[PDB]
Amino acid sequence: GMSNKFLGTWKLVSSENFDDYMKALGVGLATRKLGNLAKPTVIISKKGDIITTRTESTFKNTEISFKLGQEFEETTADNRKTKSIVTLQRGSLNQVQRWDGKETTIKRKLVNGKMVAECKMKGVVCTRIYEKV
Ligand SMILES: CCCCCC/C=C\CCCCCCCCCC(=O)O
Question: Can you tell me the distance from the alpha carbon of 28 to that of 11, in angstroms, rounded to the nearest whole number?
Answer: 25
Cβ of 31 closer than 6 Å to ligand 1, yes or no, is yes
Q: In 10 A of CB 121, how many CB atoms?
A: 20
Query: For ligand 1, atom 6, which residue shows the shortest CA distance?
Result: 35
CB 104 within 8 A of CB 119: yes
Q: Which CATH architecture has domain 1-133?
A: Beta Barrel (2.40)
Q: In 10 A of CB 27, how many CB atoms?
A: 19
Say if residue 129 carries a ligand binding annotation. Answer: yes
Cβ of 85 closer than 6 Å to ligand 1, yes or no, is no
Question: Can you tell me the distance from the alpha carbon of 62 to that of 98, in angstroms, rounded to the nearest whole number?
Answer: 17
Resolution number, Å: 1.5
Question: Can you tell me the distance from the alpha carbon of 73 to that of 122, in angstroms, rounded to the nearest whole number?
Answer: 22
Chain center to CA of 72: 15
Backbone angles phi, psi at 80, to 5 degrees: -80, 140
To 10 degrees, the CA torsion angle through 83, 52, 128, 130?
A: 180
